[PDB]
Amino acid sequence: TDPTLEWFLSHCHIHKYPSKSTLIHQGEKAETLYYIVKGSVAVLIKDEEGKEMILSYLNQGDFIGELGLFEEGQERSAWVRAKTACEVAEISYKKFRQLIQVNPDILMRLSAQMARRLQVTSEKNLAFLDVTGRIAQTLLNLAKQPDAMTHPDGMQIKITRQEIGQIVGCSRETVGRILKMLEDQNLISAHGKTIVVYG
Amino acid sequence: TDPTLEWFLSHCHIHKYPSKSTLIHQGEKAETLYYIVKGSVAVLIKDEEGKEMILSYLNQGDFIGELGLFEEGQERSAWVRAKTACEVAEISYKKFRQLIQVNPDILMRLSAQMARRLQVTSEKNLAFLDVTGRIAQTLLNLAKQPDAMTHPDGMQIKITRQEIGQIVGCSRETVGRILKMLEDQNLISAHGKTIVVYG
């Protein structure tokens, strides 16, 4: 059992959100503070060219819209929507601040993840971003070449890591540093001399 | 004045650091937890070969390795040095964990900082990363121009939002969004026609 969680939730209101239903709409005045008891949700924005862009998926046990607890008035840059029928608890920010006085443990939890949530995004300057822009261009251009292969996901090209570095003007390593990053962004794919560009 | 920051301060050792003196080394043993009372530091890393490729820039009102606090173990890759001569207060994780109980307010400001770092992360395709590389390049070359200003943090140049768009080949809005990002990353600062390039 979980002494705190159970206490915490006895101060929250749990409701169900059928898939695709929206939990928080975008310029809403933040005052909660949502805790996912079960199921998953998505954080969406619209980029230039008004396409839905997924910022993150949040799963059971995670919290929703902190960033509004430490920023009065703060709105909701990007709005929360359910992906699967899920139960979510929500508590007045005002009342939550009271819980923290009583037993500052829950605060520890939420405080948590984030951290485990940051320890995953980071370990990542101007000089660096420049090369990242150049390499992305090289791959973008090669996909439009007549010698490009057609891939179910997009276009597949042929080039060595050293060739990328020679073209852009960087070490073979810097290429791997960037290729790995781009690959983690689900934008490209690297295996030997074969590289595939998505979209 | 800042009460919750005044108590939390009396409960820990504040250290002075001359510029270019390292605070945190690689492989460390995470048990702190520093708070920059005054000045600025730089999160470095030594790369493939060598080259201190930098990583960040933390200033007054910042916590350090706050990720270590949670989750036993963790020393501790990363790195830290003082850019300018700065005063840094530090406290053992375990004592802090006790203070959290005494007055949780300080756990607020630690969580607050973590929240802000999430904001920056979520706000991140190939085409976009390409433009980001070109824009940084324009700012990079201009700071080396004879008509650049001497700024305490680096070099300050003169250019409008639309001028950058014309050079790179993007909308006036695209420049706006990218300038926001780069300023949040602590690489530049924008104020009207004035743009200052750090470093």
Swiss-Prot record, chains A, B:
At the top level, the lineage of the source is Bacteria
Q: Which residue ranges does the record annotate as region Activating region 1 (AR1)?
A: 145-154
Where does the HTH crp-type domain lie?
A: 129-199
Q: Which GO terms describe its cellular component?
A: cytosol
Which of UniProt's keywords are assigned here? Answer: Acetylation, Activator, cAMP, cAMP-binding, DNA-binding, Nucleotide-binding, Transcription, Transcription regulation
The UniProt annotation places 3',5'-cyclic AMP 1 binding at: 50-56, 65-67, 76-77, 121-122
UniProt subunit comment: Homodimer, which upon binding cAMP is able to bind DNA. Binds the N- and C-terminus of RNA polymerase subunit RpoA and sigma-70 (RpoD).
Q: Which PANTHER family match?
A: CRP FAMILY TRANSCRIPTIONAL REGULATORY PROTEIN, DNA-BINDING TRANSCRIPTIONAL DUAL REGULATOR CRP
Say what the protein does.
A global transcription regulator. Complexes with cyclic AMP (cAMP) which allosterically activates DNA binding to regulate transcription. It can act as an activator, repressor, coactivator or corepressor. Induces a severe bend in DNA. Acts as a negative regulator of its own synthesis as well as for adenylate cyclase (cyaA), which generates cAMP. Plays a major role in carbon catabolite repression (CCR).
Q: What is this protein called?
A: cAMP-activated global transcriptional regulator CRP
Instruction: Write down the species.
Output: Shigella flexneri
Q: Which gene encodes it?
A: crp
